[PDB]
Design an enzyme around this catalytic site. Structure first.
Site, PDB file in Angstrom:
ATOM      1  CG  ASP A 104      -4.060   3.226  -0.848  1.00 52.09           C
ATOM      2  OD1 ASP A 104      -4.483   4.272  -1.383  1.00 52.09           O
ATOM      3  OD2 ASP A 104      -3.761   2.203  -1.499  1.00 52.09           O
ATOM      4  CD  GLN A 105      -1.361   5.952   7.591  1.00 47.99           C
ATOM      5  OE1 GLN A 105      -1.475   6.989   6.940  1.00 47.99           O
ATOM      6  NE2 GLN A 105      -0.986   5.945   8.863  1.00 47.99           N
ATOM      7  CG  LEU A 142      -2.069  -1.023   1.194  1.00 51.07           C
ATOM      8  CD1 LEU A 142      -2.696  -1.150   2.572  1.00 51.07           C
ATOM      9  CD2 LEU A 142      -3.109  -0.637   0.165  1.00 51.07           C
ATOM     10  CG  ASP A 143      -0.428   4.271  -2.181  1.00 46.62           C
ATOM     11  OD1 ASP A 143      -1.081   3.209  -2.106  1.00 46.62           O
ATOM     12  OD2 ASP A 143      -0.826   5.276  -2.806  1.00 46.62           O
ATOM     13  CB  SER A 144       1.371   7.816   2.389  1.00 48.78           C
ATOM     14  OG  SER A 144       1.377   8.604   1.211  1.00 48.78           O
TER      15      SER A 144
END
Ligand SMILES: CCCCCCCCCCCCCCCCCC(=O)OC[C@H](COP(=O)([O-])OCC(O)COP(=O)([O-])OC[C@@H](COC(=O)CCCCCCCCCCCCCCCCC)OC(=O)CCCCCCCCCCCCCCCCC)OC(=O)CCCCCCCCCCCCCCCCC
Ligand SMILES: CCCCCCCCCCCCCCCCCC(=O)OC[C@H](COP(=O)(O)OCCN)OC(=O)CCCCCCCCCCCCCCCCC
Lengths: 77, 67, 12, 202, 115, 88, 178, 97, 459, 126
Positions: free
Chosen positions: F46-47, F42-44
């Site tokens: 998405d966090q 995932l990427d930021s």
């Protein structure tokens, strides 16, 4: 404790989430969280609360009792 | 005494459903009783005459020819 | 289940 | 809504109709307090949430509170033969049947329309849409402390205006002969407000 | 109403001013006029404790109404016929006032076409 | 004070629920100690949404200075537990 | 709350917080969840488009243009979680958050009703009195001499030692005490 | 981005400490020690006696003093029969309608 | 009057000849008993004022002040026991003797038929007050405060002495019964105007005025709790009593020599009540509120109407009680943290729940919450002024607003808000200080129940 | 229609060009500020957590605030043509205004009173 339903039953299909997913994937975009908002349109929530259904709630038996008392007041004169 | 559910629609006690239904049915029964017996409150019920349908003879303005 | 509720000294 | 009704009472006092203003004072408390208490039930159940955006349908999940809230909103509007009618009707009649400033008359009618409008806003974002509140449900409105006072206030909101207005002595002289489009004007106003808000929200 | 569209525009001069009514003598037409009769005497209305706003040639049906309301207690739903009579008399008085208004309006039209 | 008290196992179950309902993740390879950007790819951005969903789920808000530090779902559980004073 | 902000805010953090605020205000406009999902997919598309833009001059310019656009068409009355700054129940329970030292003034009568609790309390107080000096020296011996500090606390490196400055994080009154 | 190895151990230690403290805030059955331990008579006790004292006060102090209780005169109507004087108010002249 | 004064004297040998441990109890109890004895002056069953001798008397104006002065002594003694606990026995006895001498001299001043005895004692009340301030105050500004307090008063009083001697040489006596029946219109002239100034400015500086009021906050701030109490409650009332007594012989020059002072008072009311907003020191806040309140007394006395004198007497009594109370309340928290700043301790309702009700009730009496007598005075003064000029109510009302504002600010930022968790030294409330607040408050309830006592000669 | 700041409605620091700065001098300043603030935070917490503390924590910044707003004023006050004029007006302007107000109102009143034409039907108490 509270048992949690199976995460897999939440399906886009049968909701406005389907329409939105189609309008999106048209231009190549996909909505991942769609399923986490599904329960708001499934089960007993599945439906449509229209304005008349709320206002006229109880109109049936109210009308019935109105007729009953009207007929009674005719009988009595 | 309730069972707190998760993402599901809960069951209801006969009490609240029936009591709200009774309140609403009472409201509508009242609005129909008073409307059938007393409909002369939301509507005019006193004929508002025409100020232009009156007769000069009945108001008093003379011929104006000569008086 | 029950918990101690912190309170000042209300004796005085 | 309460501030608006206070403005309306002051209007009433402006055209020399104090008894009408006091009767509205007495008839207003019932449905206004029932409205606040329905709101308080909804808030205590949804964990202090007060923002209609996270309320959703409340018929299915709080039928009793919802019916009482609808009764309150109706009484606030005209809805003939409830508590509010027996005052607001004569208020509108007196204002549209006296030598009054035209701008005041106009904005009062507009404000009755807006009354219907935001009543419907509540009824929509709190009673007719689909949920926006958190997924855990800890709703309970069965405690008799919640139901008995609300239903007493509902009986009030329904019958009290009739009761009073028929038991009081005749204080002033109401004008009871006016064109159809003035005796039915409050109802027309409220209905148009309902329809307009319904369309805007849909 | 439209009595305002004819005054505030389109020849204000030939429409009435509510503050000054009547502005013509009663003998300008109506050679004889039966000055309105008031049934109720001052002592009746004083004893019944009426308000100055309520003694307007329609106080006798109002007195019958208050008497009915007193005698028929706690039956506050009775006395609905007497209410109708008071309302009727007040409606007739309002009709007479409308008549005065329209009479003055029509007299103004004369001064327009007489000149 | 009508809501059932909050318990760790329930917190974990609901977090993993919300996560399984996230289409960019595979339930099979999901567990605590799993990292969003490294194990789950995932990427930021998405966090951010993950933490937003945690909020909308539990009904409160988590500041960005702390949310930025939440990568393993066990960190989310421990934060939600230290905020709501659960100990069992 | 639990962490202390850094000296300055990086660029990625700025972008993430803009993303968060935008999505929240958009939820506030898009009240219905489907509408919100749709326009949120659109917003993520708008962000991800310039995601691999390597230059910084244009990156900051895009960021500032986005901040401007956000300040415009900004919901005046956005949703605010109740227990959060600007919410209904923000500090509604901060009046029942009595600290612990208010018990050092309790009367022995009030205490005899909760004996086990006060035995435990004396245990805790002994724990603290013992760990104080050790954590103080642990702090003074590992301060970077560079001269710049960070506001963050160290853990208990040595075993048997308690983490420095813990009596106010621990012993912190609960969040809904009644 | 993420907790540093040191901050994480710090959090773990503070966490076990906090979860011991909160467990200590839990109460035992025997605490608080708390030593040592008629349908609607409220009506009588809170209405009847107060009415007695208030009736005493009113009737024997407020009345028995001038211009303390003053009542708007009662309505008199044509056709009524005054009580003390026995006077009979003549009815009204007959309406033409 | 001797039956009230000689016991107050024997209190001194009781103070000194008593064992170090039983010195406080004895004096406190017997002072309470003397406050009781002073209640016979209220036995006035006629319009003929009480003359006990050629020197001592008591009218409806002096009786309330005498009773207040006899009742404040035990409260001051109590308030002055937490400090002085570490001082030597002799110092404690000296403090108690200062307070007793103040009581005695004030009872004399209010009982005096002649203005020279009044002046001698009016001035003698400087020695014990100055000693209390400069010897038992805590900061270094003690000394400048005492200097201001001495010399404002003396520079004002000297002309008063000259004018009294002039009146003596012209009339034959400074008796107040004689100077009221044997009176003559004062021909309007610059000489008689300067006579008016001389007769008035001493009291005006003691009330005080707005332009000359800097001696009061310095003192209150730098004075121990007892000095602050007696000062605020009595040593200001002294000037109003003097003006009320001496304004009979200044007629009609008071009609046009008042505008300056009425005006200064009405405006400084607003100025001081506004200061009470941007003020870090709680004691300074109380002092500026006192100034704002005494401005009304000055204006009222200047217009000299019956409603005016009545409202002035009521406001004097009520303000004395409530200001003594507020200073007690402030010193309560001071004894814990040893700071006078109103921003440091700002959550004290979560520790002292009962002491907050005293704060609430006082701040409600500070503002005009009815049916308080703090309100009846303000109301009748407002009415008298409105009759004077219908444009006074503007300033009166903005003062009312500001008063509510700063009283609410006080209690909010002191009691309400988040508690200061570092204040581990917030010991619970002492039974003694609680008794203090109770003794300050209950008499307000009782007066509100029976206001006929604090009206004055006009009613 | 873009935001325009005001002394009350200020700039949100997200439309300020001083936050969108990567300049190393600015960042060195920020770091120095964080260092000062952390130093003070540690100096405060070493007392807030000292279990051998029986008294409150003295704040010298507050002491300076109060010493400056009350006692450091007059020494650091020198008269000026602006100070003097503002003082003169603030002191003797409202007084003059209200004096003429009251004087005019009361002269008019007393004129009517001596003359007549002003009625006080039921004034009994004044
Ligand atoms: C007012 C002027 C006061 C100026 C301030 C002076 C001052 O600072 O006080 C000294 C103060 C020094 O404090 P200290 O060292 O503790 O005093 C010990 C000295 O040796 C001085 O005290 P001492 O221990 O040496 O003397 C012992 C003596 C204590 O006596 C004193 O030494 C001090 C007495 C000073 C007179 C205070 C009376 C005030 C009357 C007001 C009315 O104890 C007694 O036996 C008391 C007997 C009565 C003494 C006379 C008191 C006035 C008589 C009033 C009538 C009542 C009796 C009949 O400073
Ligand atoms: C309760 C507080 C009520 C306050 C109003 C005063 C009424 C009580 C009262 O004063 O009556 C006492 C009465 C003697 O009264 P009297 O002789 O006329 O004059 C007293 C002269 N010092 O002595 C008696 O007659 C004894 C009679 C029994 C005691 C009085 C009965 C209760 C009176 C309640 C009436 C007022 C209730 C309304 C007050 C609250 C309204 C906010």
């Amino acid at each position: 404790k509270m048992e949690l339903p199976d995460y897999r039953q939440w399906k886009i299909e049968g909701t406005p989430l389907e329409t939105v997913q189609k309008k999106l994937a048209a231009r190549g975009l996909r909505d991942p969280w769609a399923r986490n908002e599904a329960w708001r349109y499934m089960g007993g929530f599945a439906g449509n609360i229209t304005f008349p259904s709320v206002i006229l709630k109880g109109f049936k038996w109210g009308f019935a009792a109105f007729v009953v008392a009207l007929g009674a007041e005719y009988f009595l004169d | 005494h309730i069972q707190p559910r998760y993402r599901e629609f809960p069951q209801l006690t006969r009490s609240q459903v029936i009591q709200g239904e009774f309140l609403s049915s009472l409201m509508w029964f009242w609005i129909l009783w008073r409307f059938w017996h007393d409909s002369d409150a939301v509507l005019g019920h006193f004929s508002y005459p025409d100020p232009s349908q009156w007769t000069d003879e009945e108001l008093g303005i003379p011929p104006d020819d000569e008086d | 289940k029950r918990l101690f509720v912190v309170k000042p000294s209300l004796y005085y | 809504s309460t501030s608006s009704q206070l403005g309306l009472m002051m209007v009433t006092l402006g055209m020399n109709q104090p008894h009408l203003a006091f009767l509205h004072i007495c008839t207003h408390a019932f449905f206004k307090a029932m409205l606040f208490m329905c709101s308080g039930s909804i808030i205590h159940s949804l964990a202090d949430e007060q923002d209609i955006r996270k309320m959703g349908n409340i018929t299915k999940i709080m039928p009793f509170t919802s019916s009482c809230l609808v009764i309150g909103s109706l009484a606030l509007t005209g809805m003939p033969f409830l508590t509010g009618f027996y005052s607001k009707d004569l208020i509108i009649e007196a204002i549209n049947t006296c030598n009054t400033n035209a701008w005041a008359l106009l904005i009062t009618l507009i404000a009755t329309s807006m009354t219907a409008m935001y009543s419907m806003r509540i009824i929509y974002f709190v009673t007719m849409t689909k949920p926006r509140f958190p997924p855990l449900i800890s709703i309970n409105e069965n405690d008799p402390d919640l139901m008995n006072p609300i239903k007493r206030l509902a009986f009030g909101s329904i019958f009290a205006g009739f009761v009073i207005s028929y038991n009081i002595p005749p204080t002033s002289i109401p004008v009871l002969t006016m064109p159809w489009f003035l005796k039915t004007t409050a109802l027309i106003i409220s209905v148009l407000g309902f329809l307009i808000a319904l369309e805007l929200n849909n | 109403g439209a009595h305002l569209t004819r005054r505030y525009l389109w020849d204000a001069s030939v429409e009435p001013d509510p503050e000054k009514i009547p502005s013509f003598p009663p003998d300008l037409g109506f050679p004889e006029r039966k000055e309105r009769v008031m049934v109720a005497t001052q002592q009746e209305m004083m004893d019944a404790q009426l308000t100055l706003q309520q003694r307007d040639y329609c106080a006798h049906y109002l007195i019958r109404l208050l008497k009915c309301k007193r005698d028929s207690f706690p039956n506050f739903l009775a006395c609905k016929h007497e209410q109708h009579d008071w309302d009727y008399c007040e409606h007739l008085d309002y009709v007479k006032r409308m008549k005065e208004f329209e009479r003055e309006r029509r007299l103004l039209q004369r001064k327009k076409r007489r000149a | 004070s009508d809501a059932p008290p909050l318990t760790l196992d329930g917190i974990k179950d609901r977090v993993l629920y919300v996560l399984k309902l996230y289409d960019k993740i595979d339930p099979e390879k999901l567990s605590v100690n799993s990292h969003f950007m490294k194990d789950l790819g995932l990427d930021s951005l998405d966090q951010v949404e993950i933490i937003m969903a945690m909020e909308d789920e539990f009904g409160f808000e988590i500041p960005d200075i702390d949310a930025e530090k939440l990568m393993c779902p066990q960190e989310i559980v421990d934060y939600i537990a230290d905020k709501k004073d659960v100990y069992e | 709350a639990f962490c202390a902000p850094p000296a300055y805010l990086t660029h990625q953090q700025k972008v993430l917080r803009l993303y968060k605020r935008a999505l929240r205000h958009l939820e506030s406009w898009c009240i219905h969840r489907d509408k919100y999902r749709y326009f949120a997919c659109l917003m993520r598309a708008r962000f991800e488009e310039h995601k691999n833009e390597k230059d910084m001059m244009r990156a900051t310019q895009l960021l500032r243009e986005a901040e401007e656009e956000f300040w415009q068409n900004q919901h005046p009355q956005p949703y605010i979680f109740p227990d959060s700054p600007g919410g209904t129940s923000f500090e509604r329970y901060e009046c029942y958050k009595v600290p612990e030292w208010c018990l050092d003034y309790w009367h022995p009568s009030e205490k005899a009703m909760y004996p086990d609790y006060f035995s435990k309390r004396e245990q805790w107080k002994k724990l603290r009195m013992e760990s104080w000096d050790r954590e103080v020296k642990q702090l003074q011996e590992e301060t970077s001499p560079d001269g710049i500090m960070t506001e963050a606390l160290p853990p208990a490196r040595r075993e048997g030692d308690l983490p420095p400055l813990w009596w106010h994080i621990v012993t912190r009154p609960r969040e809904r005490p009644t | 981005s993420g907790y540093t190895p040191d901050e994480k151990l710090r959090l773990q230690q503070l966490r076990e400490l906090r979860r011991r403290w909160l467990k200590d805030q839990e109460l035992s059955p025997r605490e608080p020690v708390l030593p040592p331990r008629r349908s609607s008579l409220f009506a009588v006790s809170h209405v009847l006696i107060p009415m007695w004292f208030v009736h005493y006060y009113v009737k024997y102090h407020m009345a028995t003093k001038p211009y303390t209780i003053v009542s708007s005169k009662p309505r008199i109507f044509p056709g009524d029969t005054i009580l003390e004087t026995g006077e009979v108010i003549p009815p009204m002249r007959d309406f033409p309608d | 009057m001797l039956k009230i004064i000689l016991p107050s004297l024997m209190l001194l040998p009781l103070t000194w000849l008593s064992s170090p441990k039983k010195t406080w109890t004895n004096v406190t109890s017997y002072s309470f008993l003397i406050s009781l004895t002073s209640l016979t002056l209220l036995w006035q069953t006629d319009e003929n004022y009480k003359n006990f001798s050629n020197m001592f008397s008591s009218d409806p104006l002096s009786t309330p002040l005498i009773i207040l002065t006899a009742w404040l002594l035990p409260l001051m003694l109590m308030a002055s026991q937490n400090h002085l606990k570490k001082d030597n026995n002799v110092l404690q006895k000296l403090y108690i003797s200062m307070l007793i001498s103040l009581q005695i001299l004030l009872i004399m001043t209010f009982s005096a038929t002649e203005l020279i005895m009044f002046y001698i004692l009016f001035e003698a009340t400087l020695i014990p007050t100055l000693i209390i301030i400069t010897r038992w105050g805590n900061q270094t500004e003690r000394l400048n405060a005492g200097i201001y307090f001495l010399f404002y008063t003396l520079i004002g009083s000297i002309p008063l002495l000259i004018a009294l001697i002039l009146i003596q040489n012209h009339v034959g006596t400074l008796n107040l019964m004689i100077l009221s029946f044997t009176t003559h219109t004062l021909d309007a002239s610059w000489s008689n105007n300067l006579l008016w100034l001389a007769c008035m400015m001493a009291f005006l500086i003691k009330m005080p005025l707005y332009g000359v009021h800097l001696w009061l906050p310095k003192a209150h701030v730098e004075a121990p709790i007892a000095g602050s109490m007696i000062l605020a409650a009595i040593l200001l009332k002294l000037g109003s009593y003097g003006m009320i007594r001496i304004s009979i012989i200044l007629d009609p020059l008071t009609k046009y020599m008042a505008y300056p002072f009425i005006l200064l008072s009405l405006w400084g009311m607003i100025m001081t009540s506004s200061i009470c907003l941007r003020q870090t020191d709680l004691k300074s806040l109380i002092a500026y509120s006192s100034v704002s309140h005494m401005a009304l007394v000055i204006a009222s006395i200047m217009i000299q109407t019956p409603w005016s004198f009545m409202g002035a007497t009521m406001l004097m009594i009520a303000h004395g009680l409530t200001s003594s109370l507020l200073f007690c309340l402030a010193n309560s928290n001071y004894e814990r943290i040893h700071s006078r700043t109103m921003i440091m301790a700002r959550g004290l309702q979560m520790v002292f729940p009962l002491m907050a009700t005293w704060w609430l009730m006082a701040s409600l009496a500070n503002l005009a919450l009815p049916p308080s007598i703090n309100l009846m005075g303000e109301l009748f003064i407002t009415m008298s002024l409105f009759s004077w000029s219908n444009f006074t109510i503007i300033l009166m009302g903005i003062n009312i607003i500001i008063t509510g504002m700063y009283s609410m600010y006080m209690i909010i930022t002191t009691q309400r808000g988040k508690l200061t968790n570092h204040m581990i030294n917030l010991q619970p409330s002492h039974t003694r200080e609680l008794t203090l607040m109770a003794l300050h408050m209950i008499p307000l309830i009782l007066l509100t129940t029976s206001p006929k006592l604090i009206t004055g000669l006009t009613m | 229609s873009k935001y325009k700041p005001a002394p009350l409605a200020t700039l949100p620091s997200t439309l300020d060009p001083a936050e969108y700065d990567v300049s190393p001098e600015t960042r060195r300043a920020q770091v120095e500020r964080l260092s000062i603030r952390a130093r003070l935070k540690r100096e405060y917490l070493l007392q807030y957590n000292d279990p051998k503390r029986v008294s409150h924590i003295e704040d010298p910044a507050l002491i300076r605030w109060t010493y400056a707003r009350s006692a450091n004023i007059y020494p650091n006050f020198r008269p000026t043509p602006k100070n003097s004029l503002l003082g003169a007006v603030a002191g003797f302007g409202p007084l003059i205004f209200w004096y003429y107000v009251f004087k005019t109102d009361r002269d008019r009143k007393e004129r009517l009173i001596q003359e007549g034409k002003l009625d006080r039907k039921f004034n009994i108490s004044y």
